[PDB]
Design a protein around this nucleic acid. Structure first.
Ligand SMILES: [Zn+2]
Ligand SMILES: [Zn+2]
Ligand SMILES: [Zn+2]
Ligand SMILES: [Zn+2]
Length: 1237
RNA sequence: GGACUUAAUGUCACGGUACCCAAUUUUCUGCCCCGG
RNA sequence: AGUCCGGGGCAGAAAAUUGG
């Protein structure tokens, strides 16, 4: 008669499955999969929006479980009303079994038989079961049930609008992972809903009988499991943005930037990290300061207006959907615009086909025992960034079946990071399995309960979903798949990961309902705890091998309730299900009645199972690296934002303050753990020689076990490499510019200036890089010594951290070990040569021209069979070459980052004030300078090709067509490759030789130039861009060759006529800087790996040409500035085999049996005689230094200079076709020291 | 409240981490000669 | 035939943004 209506208060994302029909359930095994979940209904025939509900039989079963447990904990004394065990058996005559069996450990008593119960004085348990009711199972046909559990429809939130399924349910994927491997054994769909809006259900229950109210109310207040989540029970633009993306893609298409229709989309999606003002306040980075072209991508005129203003207008017209939801949507639209033109297994196992035993299994607790419960709550901090997976992007489509980018992180409808309950439960399962030492892998579909070692405690433990107290867009980490064959990027190798920020805190609960608190839980809770040394090791989440998902549970507080005497207080309070947020900050003085904290908790070093199989599983050892060279991490995509106009910037992490909200304003510069892993993997592969094989799917070599494979999870996992020595520089970030000098004109290419922007760092003050790497307790002695050798290879600087190693960036120079108990791995870790070759150089030993051309004909040889960049080869040499860079003439190397370094701009506005290159206040030399000069020298010596050529040019058109089809630059790696690029390295192939940064640390610091008018500096004559029109004027003449300058003491003229060139003419249109003195001792290194024997000698004596020959460096090369010669200190060589652990150097007997092989090989294309070769003689003639006589070399003037031209030999008489025809002009620029007079 | 949507003497889906391999990267001197 | 002429033109193109 009297009716009860109750509400369902959900405090965790529940589940719901399409109901279909009972007869149609067996058709869809997902139906029996979701019989314990909620249900969904469809109104129309077009699968339109409907309504959701939970079956009344489900809440009936929940009530039955609640009464069974409550009566079992009460020992059958429910306020003096005994209850019988009850009947759970069917098939009395012909079956008629209920739609759901039990297959559960039913709890009963010893006897529990006060009297025989019939349908006259039935027990309250009988009434709740309704065994003696007046209704059957076939159909209702009336309200004849003693107790009725009707539908539980929605709350008031379900207005008559017929809410869409998308607004209430979201598609999701649930996984399962085996122990020994790490691959997803099986995945299946799920429809995890939300508890924010549609988190309440209302249902009506009827109880015709009277002697059942107290137990029913106690059960209703005791149930804590409903649809798969906690519950509290009480009694009561896609079209306009699509068109815009199409328009902008078409505009970029006619803008010839067909390939560039993706890099702007990447940066636009990156804009969600930044605020509205990143595109609204003023603009994206402006770009070139004075080129009158703007930024190479953002200041581009699209549909008339600039791209930095067209998108601003778009934002102004689309402010409705906010910043994040507009930026992400526009990025997805751009991805779709580009992509419009450019198997796994499931396992549900919910069926009765296995068997039909369904045997009753009584389980009676022992008499006199005390059963308690424990709630473990705290904060789950993440000391490392965390990534959580999700189904394919934009493929969720809830309610239907059969952005688009990256591996999206899991976010709720609130659009913030969240740890799914299932992931935390699985991590706990794995950790408890490790603590036990043995168990059974989870196999679904089992009709009988799995009596595993760890499965027993799973029935008695529960935990809830966790959501961030933080809502910001996540950064997008970049990963590449570099081929070990060529150490570069191949097709289909880049992808994106949307990791979160480190330091974020999460709520975390662990409620255990068992007889006694197990020691394994008490050990794993300290294993996760962040103690003084443990620091937490909860590897919860995804990409655990890479280094993401190492949570450290913190601030653990213990509470326990009573189920034997204080059950009714638990019934009243319901265990604070959903109130754990207040429980986090609820102090010791505000505890409710009972619920004393569990005071039997022990310390970390007190439990046996912790020290047996919990902590030994991981042995973290932290090592600090110092680097004496600038470091660059290639964050180019993020460089298309923030002021600076720089095409290459370092990668910066993002951390969250502990105890303080929001991100610190200063980002943490760091090296990605992904590169930390890649360098180690490449090193171990090259030492083992197993890189470059077919695959590692079924392989079991030295690589698959240590670093994982397609099947098994990696047994080594790393962490982010962060820089700790940050606040000790005040100039931590240093700008360095790079150019690609044309080999035909001696100047910059048409469009090749690739400016960079790396960190700072000096050999006397290095960047302290700190990190850690984890080892599991299964590596044998050989593998441990192998990993120590892996560290030792970094100790010798073989592998450069960061990018652009071939210049000298990020050269490690030693690793130190901390005192975090690393003792497991701590224990395991003559005269310089000088060539005597002398060149005569008797072209004019007793008027010249500064730059000469080197014609070498059309004879070109290229090596089709490229030498792979795989594991080190024993016979091919590899090592370092220490050298002394000796300065003869003043050396002029400007730090072009600061155009006002000399602070002379105030006296002369608009005058460039360059400063000498220096890193962290110490004298340095750009590695790229030596790289380029030595590459030019080697290529000209080998006369192979033109490394950099200025194609598509007009000279007095088609300058690239005049050059014959044999000297073209290094094309793809199929038709051939330049021998000069075979060693130095062309595109899509890493060069084996990595140049270094020189550290002088000796000699006079400055060229004082006593008596000079300029103060603590000097001036220099303004230089003009080359005009190759006069170089190759005649159409009949084909092309000149390489451009080489001459060596002379021409700096004396500049140092003498300084006032006549800096004050008389060009008051502002001039460049000035500081130069070096003579006799400056230097030291720089030239590393290499896997070099052929015959190329090593060429490299060595092209480094040191010999006596009376020096290399040209710095500006003012036509003016004679910067004549320097480098002499080898000692050529080293290391042995791959561990037998020869110590490194060796070649004998100092003039480096015997090395250069002669290359000298002999050159004739195909005892002391060496390089003047017996037509082109080497000319090459060495141009580099001859006739000052260690004094020839004078200078540019002539057209008609009359401002101060000079003492007199003939001007640009008219020489330029006239009669007095000096152009036919002999090329001859005069090719023959060294021609007699122009 | 009937009506979309359940049977009732019996659901461990707290019976399952979208978990796994793939180094944002190699290559490039901040260089300098005459032409409407 | 009739005097001035320049001292800044490059300031990144080119290679991958999907495969088991
Ligand atoms: Zn009874
Ligand atoms: Zn088990
Ligand atoms: Zn293998
Ligand atoms: Zn080449």
């Amino acid at each position: 008669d009297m009716n009860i209506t109750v509400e369902l208060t959900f405090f965790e994302p529940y589940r719901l499955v399409e109901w279909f029909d009972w007869d149609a359930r067996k058709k869809s095994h997902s139906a029996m999969r979701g019989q314990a979940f909620a249900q969904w209904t469809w109104k129309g025939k077009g699968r339109t929006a409907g309504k959701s509900f939970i079956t009344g039989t489900l809440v009936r079963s929940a009530v039955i479980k609640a009464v069974e447990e409550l009566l079992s904990l009460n020992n059958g004394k429910w306020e003096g009303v005994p209850c019988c065990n009850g009947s759970f058996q069917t098939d009395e005559s012909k079956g008629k079994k209920p739609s759901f069996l039990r297959k559960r450990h039913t709890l009963q008593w010893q006897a529990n038989n006060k009297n025989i119960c019939d349908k006259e004085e039935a027990c309250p348990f009988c009434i709740l079961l309704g065994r003696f009711d007046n209704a059957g199972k076939v159909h209702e046909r009336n309200k004849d049930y003693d107790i009725h559990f009707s539908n539980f429809d929605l709350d008031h939130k379900q207005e008559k609008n017929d809410l869409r399924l998308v607004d209430i349910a979201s598609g999701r994927i649930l996984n399962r992972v085996d122990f020994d491997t790490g691959k997803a054994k099986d995945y299946f769909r799920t429809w995890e809903a939300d508890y924010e809006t549609y988190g309440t259900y209302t249902g009506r229950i009827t109880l015709r009988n009277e002697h059942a109210k107290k137990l029913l109310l106690a059960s209703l207040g005791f149930v804590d499991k409903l649809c798969g989540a906690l519950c509290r029970i009480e009694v009561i633009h896609n079209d306009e943005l699509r068109k815009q993306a199409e328009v902008i893609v078409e505009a970029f298409k006619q803008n010839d930037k067909l390939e560039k229709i993706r890099i702007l989309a990447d940066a636009i999606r990156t804009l969600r990290l930044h605020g509205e003002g990143v595109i609204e306040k003023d603009e994206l980075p402006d770009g070139k300061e004075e080129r009158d072209k703007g930024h190479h991508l953002w200041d581009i005129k699209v549909q008339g207006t600039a791209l930095r203003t067209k998108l601003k207008e778009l934002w102004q017209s689309n402010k409705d959907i906010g910043w994040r939801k507009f930026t992400e949507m526009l990025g997805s639209n751009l991805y779709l615009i580009y992509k419009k033109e450019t198997g796994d297994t499931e396992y549900y196992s919910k069926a009765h086909d296995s068997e039909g035993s369904d045997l009753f299994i009584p389980v009676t607790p022992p008499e006199g025992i005390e059963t308690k419960e424990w709630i473990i709550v705290g904060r789950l901090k993440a000391a490392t960034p965390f990534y959580f997976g999700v189904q394919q992007p934009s493929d969720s489509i809830p309610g239907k079946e059969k952005e688009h980018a990256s591996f999206n992180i899991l976010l709720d409808k609130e659009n913030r990071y969240r740890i799914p309950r299932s992931a935390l439960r699985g991590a706990l399962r794995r950790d408890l399995r490790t603590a036990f030492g043995s168990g059974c892998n989870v196999s679904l579909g089992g009709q009988i309960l799995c009596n595993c070692k760890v499965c027993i405690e799973m029935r008695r433990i529960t935990l809830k979903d966790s959501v961030s107290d933080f809502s910001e867009p996540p950064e997008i980490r970049y990963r590449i798949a570099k081929n070990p064959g060529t150490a570069t990027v191949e097709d289909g190798s880049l992808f994106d990961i949307e990791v979160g920020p480190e330091g974020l805190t999460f709520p975390f609960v662990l409620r255990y309902r068992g007889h006694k608190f197990p020691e394994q839980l008490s050990s794993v809770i300290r294993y996760w705890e962040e103690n003084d040394g443990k620091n937490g090791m909860a590897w919860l989440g995804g990409l655990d091998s890479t280094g993401k998902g190492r949570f450290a549970l913190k601030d653990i507080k213990i509470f326990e309730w009573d189920l034997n005497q204080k059950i009714n207080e638990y019934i009243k309070e319901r265990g604070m299900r959903g109130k754990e947020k207040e429980l986090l900050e609820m102090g010791e003085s505000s505890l409710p009645d009972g619920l004393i904290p569990y005071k039997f908790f022990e310390e970390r070093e007190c439990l046996f199972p912790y020290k047996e199989n919990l902590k030994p599983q991981w042995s973290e050892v932290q090592y600090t690296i110092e680097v004496g060279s600038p470091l660059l991490t290639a964050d180019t995509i993020s460089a298309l934002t923030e002021p600076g106009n720089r095409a290459a910037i370092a990668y910066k992490k993002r951390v969250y303050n502990d105890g303080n909200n929001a991100i610190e304003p200063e980002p943490r510069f760091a090296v990605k753990s992904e590169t930390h892993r890649g360098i180690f993997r490449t090193a171990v592969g090259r030492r083992t020689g197993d890189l470059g094989k077919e695959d590692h799917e079924d392989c079991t070599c030295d690589m698959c076990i240590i670093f994982g494979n397609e099947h098994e999870s990696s047994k080594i996992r790393f962490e982010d490499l962060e820089l700790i020595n940050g606040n000790e520089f005040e100039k931590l970030e240093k700008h360095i510019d790079h150019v690609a000098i044309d080999r035909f004109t001696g100047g910059a290419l048409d469009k090749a200036k690739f400016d960079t922007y790396p960190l700072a760092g000096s050999p006397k003050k290095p960047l302290k890089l700190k990190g850690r790497f984890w080892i599991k307790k299964g590596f044998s002695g050989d593998h441990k010594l192998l990993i120590t050798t892996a560290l030792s290879d970094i100790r010798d600087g073989l592998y450069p951290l960061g990018s652009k190693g071939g210049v000298g960036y990020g050269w490690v120079a030693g690793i130190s070990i901390d005192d975090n108990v690393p003792d497991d791995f701590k224990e395991m870790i003559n005269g310089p040569i000088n060539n005597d070759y002398v060149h005569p150089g008797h072209q004019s030993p007793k008027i010249y021209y500064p730059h000469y051309f080197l014609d070498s004909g059309s004879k070109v040889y290229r090596e089709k069979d490229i030498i792979t960049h795989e594991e080190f080869t024993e016979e091919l040499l590899s090592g370092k070459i220490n050298c002394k860079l000796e300065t003869l003439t003043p050396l002029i190397i400007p730090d072009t980052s600061d155009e006002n370094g000399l602070k002379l701009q105030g006296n002369k506005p608009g005058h460039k004030n360059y400063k000498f290159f220096n890193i962290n206040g110490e004298l340095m030399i750009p590695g790229s300078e030596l790289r380029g000069m030595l590459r030019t020298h080697f290529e000209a010596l080998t006369k192979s090709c033109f490394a950099i050529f200025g194609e598509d040019s007009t000279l007095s058109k088609t300058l690239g067509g005049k050059l014959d089809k044999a000297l073209h630059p290094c094309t793809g790696l199929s038709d051939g490759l330049c021998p000069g690029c075979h060693l130095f390295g062309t595109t899509d192939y890493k060069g084996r030789v990595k140049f270094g940064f020189a550290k002088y640390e000796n000699g006079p610091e400055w060229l004082i130039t006593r008596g000079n008018n300029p103060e603590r500096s000097l001036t220099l004559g303004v230089l003009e861009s080359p005009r190759p029109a006069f170089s190759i004027p005649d159409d009949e003449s084909e092309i000149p060759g390489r451009k080489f300058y001459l060596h002379h003491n021409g700096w004396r003229i500049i140092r003498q006529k300084q006032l006549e060139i800096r004050e008389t003419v060009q008051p502002e249109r001039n460049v000035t800087t500081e130069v070096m003195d003579k006799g400056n001792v230097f030291s720089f290194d030239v590393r290499f790996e896997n070099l052929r024997e015959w190329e090593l000698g060429l490299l060595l004596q092209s480094l040191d040409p010999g006596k009376n020959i020096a290399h040209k460096l710095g500006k003012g090369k036509p003016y004679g500035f910067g004549s320097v010669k480098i002499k080898i200190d000692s050529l080293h060589t290391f042995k791959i085999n561990s037998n020869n652990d110590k490194i060796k150097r070649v004998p100092q007997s003039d480096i015997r049996e090395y250069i002669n092989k290359g000298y002999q090989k050159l004739i195909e294309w005892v002391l060496p005689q390089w003047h017996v070769i037509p082109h080497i003689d000319k090459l060495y003639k141009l580099l001859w230094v006739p000052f260690l006589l004094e020839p004078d070399v200078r540019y002539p003037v057209l008609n009359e200079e401002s101060k000079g031209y003492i007199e003939d030999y001007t640009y008219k008489k020489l330029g006239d076709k009669d007095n000096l025809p152009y036919k002999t002009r090329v001859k005069g620029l090719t023959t060294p020291w021609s007699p122009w007079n």
